[PDB]
Amino acid sequence: RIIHPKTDDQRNRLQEACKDILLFKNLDPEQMSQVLDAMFEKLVKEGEHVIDQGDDGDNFYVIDRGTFDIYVKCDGVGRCVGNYDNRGSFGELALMYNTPRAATITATSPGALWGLDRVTFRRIIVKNNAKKRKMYESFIESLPFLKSLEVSERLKVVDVIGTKVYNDGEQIIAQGDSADSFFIVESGEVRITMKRNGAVEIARCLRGQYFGELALVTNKPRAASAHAIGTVKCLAMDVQAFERLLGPCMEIMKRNIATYEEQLVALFGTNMDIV
Numbered sequence: 001r002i003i004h005p006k007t008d009d010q011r012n013r014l015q016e017a018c019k020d021i022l023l024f025k026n027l028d029p030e031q032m033s034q035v036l037d038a039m040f041e042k043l044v045k046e047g048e049h050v051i052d053q054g055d056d057g058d059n060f061y062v063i064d065r066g067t068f069d070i071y072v073k074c075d076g077v078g079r080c081v082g083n084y085d086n087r088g089s090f091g092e093l094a095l096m097y098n099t100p101r102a103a104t105i106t107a108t109s110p111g112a113l114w115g116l117d118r119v120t121f122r123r124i125i126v127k128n129n130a131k132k133r134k135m136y137e138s139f140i141e142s143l144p145f146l147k148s149l150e151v152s153e154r155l156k157v158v159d160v161i162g163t164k165v166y167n168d169g170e171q172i173i174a175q176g177d178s179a180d181s182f183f184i185v186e187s188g189e190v191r192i193t194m195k196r197n198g199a200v201e202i203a204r205c206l207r208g209q210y211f212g213e214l215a216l217v218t219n220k221p222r223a224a225s226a227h228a229i230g231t232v233k234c235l236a237m238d239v240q241a242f243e244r245l246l247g248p249c250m251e252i253m254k255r256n257i258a259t260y261e262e263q264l265v266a267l268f269g270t271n272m273d274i275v
């Protein structure tokens with residue numbers, strides 16, 4: 001076991017930084033404690049290359065604070081495929097598939113990261129993903145909207161999703177809120193409402209259906225709220241995973257978007273500007 005001593009201020013900041021990391025959701029309190037003890041802090045300077053495309057993987061990072069740009073060099077040209085804003089994680093691909101870094105991550109401000117060495121990672125996270133794969137691989141392959149992906153790409157979706165459970169009445173997401181997750185209902189029922197004024201029910205999602213994609217596609221705040229009816233289980237994915245893996249089905253989703261407009265105009269007379 002690898003262990004790094006941390007001040008009290010570090011443990012509080014570390015625990016708060018890890019609370020929403022999807023790759024840690026399917027871990028028991030004991031595996032999680034080992035991960036926490038293995039975490040070490042790392043300061044980064046603005047302009048610093050935390051990760052360079054092509055290198056061997058070494059650590060997995062959870063963001064404590066700071067901004068970062070994501071670059072993928074495609075044919076001598078560097079594209080900015082996204083960014084991180086004071087929250088999130090990265091560097092898990094090289095450690096899961098033993099491949100070279102697939103992108104360059106640069107800090108665009110001073111910041112801090114929580115690192116986790118590859119050994120502790122593969123020993124716990126990777127071991128845990130195998131378990132996750134046995135529970136959901138079948139379910140994910142069967143989703144109609146994911147048929148657009150190559151079969152190998154679909155299997156990779158399982159590696160980065162995390163399970164989230166909600167009790168009856170819990171708010172899953174709120175209208176007007178910023179968005180960082182894409183959801184897939186695993187079990188239970190999710191009620192979608194929108195405020196004209198009072199809240200109006202506009203849709204319900206059952207096993208196999210998704211929601212929370214509109215904000216990620218149009219880059220806007222959540223257009224509606226979502227609450228759980230009874231006990232709900234959702235498979236969540238962060239926006240970076242969404243953009244890396246679901247590009248192939250940005251059509252089927254774009255096609256479902258148009259429907260959102262018609263429905264709202266029909267119910268309210270205005271499209272509420274969701275596009």
Ligand SMILES: Nc1ncnc2c1ncn2[C@@H]1O[C@@H]2COP(=O)(O)O[C@H]2[C@H]1O
Nearest residue numbers: 081090091092093094101102103240244
């Ligand atoms: N579109 C993307 N392609 C590849 N890596 C990405 C992308 N968006 C974010 N990343 C992250 O950037 C990291 C770069 O190193 P890794 O390949 O280990 O893991 C990668 C992911 O965690």
Ligand SMILES: Nc1ncnc2c1ncn2[C@@H]1O[C@@H]2COP(=O)(O)O[C@H]2[C@H]1O
Nearest residue numbers: 192203211212213214215222223224260
């Ligand atoms: N008519 C609709 N307009 C907007 N969002 C809708 C509608 N029907 C269902 N939704 C879903 O509710 C989600 C609310 O958050 P998002 O905007 O991220 O994504 C939205 C869609 O997935």
